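Dissemination and training. As part of the outreach component of the grant, students in the summer workshop were shown how a complex can be specified as a set of sequence lines and then modelled as a single object. The example used during the hands-on session is reproduced here so that future cohorts can follow it. Participants entered these lines:
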Amino acid sequence: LPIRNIPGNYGLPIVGPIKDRWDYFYDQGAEEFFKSRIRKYNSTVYRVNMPPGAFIAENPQVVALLDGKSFPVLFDVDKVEKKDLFTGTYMPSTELTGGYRILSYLDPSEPKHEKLKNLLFFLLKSSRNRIFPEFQATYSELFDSLEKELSLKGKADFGGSSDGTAFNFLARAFYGTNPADTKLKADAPGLITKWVLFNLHPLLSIGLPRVIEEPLIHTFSLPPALVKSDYQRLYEFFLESAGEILVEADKLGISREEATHNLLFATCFNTWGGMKILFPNMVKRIGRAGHQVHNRLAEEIRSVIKSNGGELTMGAIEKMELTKSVVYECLRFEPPVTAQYGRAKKDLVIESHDAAFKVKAGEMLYGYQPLATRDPKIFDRADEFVPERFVGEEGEKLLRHVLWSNGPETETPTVGNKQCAGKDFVVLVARLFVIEIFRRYDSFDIEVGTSPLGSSVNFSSLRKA
Ligand code: HEM
Ligand SMILES: CCCCC[C@@H]1O[C@@H]1C/C=C\CCCCCCCC(=O)O
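and obtained this result:
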């Protein structure tokens, strides 16, 4: 391929980044922010400032990788460092996480990265026999509550009930603990939300005018001290609930304190936060796919479950072709976490589809995943949600291009990479979500809107079987 100069510029100091930040949050939004510049530069690889800049990030300058050929460089640990850039060009204060640099911020070359990731592998593996009955029991309550709300109001706010459900499910599946039986009561969603806000506010817009938002959440960090006691409530819950997992932490040579802050982060930020983005988006997309798709999903899931003697099992789910594919299409069409960063360890040649580009050691690389996963030179009808995309031998090959987990879907998280530790779990619970919906309902209608993180979704009808 021809070597090309990386297009784009960073504009003037201070003023360049601010204008790019207004574009990103207010005047264009992220998708059009990235696409308008692809069109301008005639390149899917270019230089751009990324938020937050201001006083929170020291350097907003990145090289954006916005196609599915160049983006995978971000998985390659021989090529990029993955230290302290989970949230990009800035890092939330370790005051927010008990003074620790949590697993998600550690490079694979740090020994504690191996210990902590192995701990989460154990967390997940040791919960395998609770996932099914706990998901089915807690999500059954969710849908009871949603049917109730629909009959009262004529619509049912999904996100307003499903946040509690997700956390209840995680506590019971991961720790055999019902939050209702603890001091947390039903408080966890609110505590986690505030704490996540304190972590992620430099990257978020909450719909307020820019005159308020910019000074309040985009220039300076929100003080960690103001969430410290909310965090302590969550910490004490993990300390008292994580008994069996803490013995294994002890065996792995991890302090009880470090294990607990890490278990909290993994459950509350990685898992519950990812679920908080994913499930309402799934409802939105599946809802938009229409009633014929719902009926086909319903017929598949029910038949397969009946063929399995009414028992839902891991192996039964492998039969549910459209179900597996729909889940994959949700993850491709709309990756829940869109921002992946990596610092070039050495000088690199990054190939895109029509040119190659030279980056120097130390440059921050950034990918906006939905432009890699909706890349029209990799996927046909790339901006269409196609439920059956991954069905059959030929569709399954395309999975290596589904990147939600910070790696190809065909690859496994290891202690050596930075691929999502809960990869298999996420795909599992997302499938169980679809299974629970369509073993109850032949179809549904939604009303949708925007959320600071993902989507705001209402059911306006739920057609029971
Ligand atoms: C639907 C929910 C989830 C979503 C959307 C999601 C997405 C992601 C993404 C994109 C990354 C890469 C971060 C980066 O380096 O830029 C990541 C990393 C990570 N995730 Fe997940 N994830 C989810 C659930 C989970 C679960 C269930 C676990 C269970 C323990 C988990 C644990 C982790 C950990 C420990 C890392 C850092 C990996 C490492 O340092 O090697 N996440 N996740
Ligand atoms: C809300 C919690 C996000 C899900 C957590 C899961 O561990 C991955 C998060 C990876 C990087 C976090 C970046 C924070 C921005 C999240 C929303 C905006 C976006 O999608 O980029």
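The chain is about 50% helix and 10% strand. Students were then asked to discuss how this feature might be tested experimentally.
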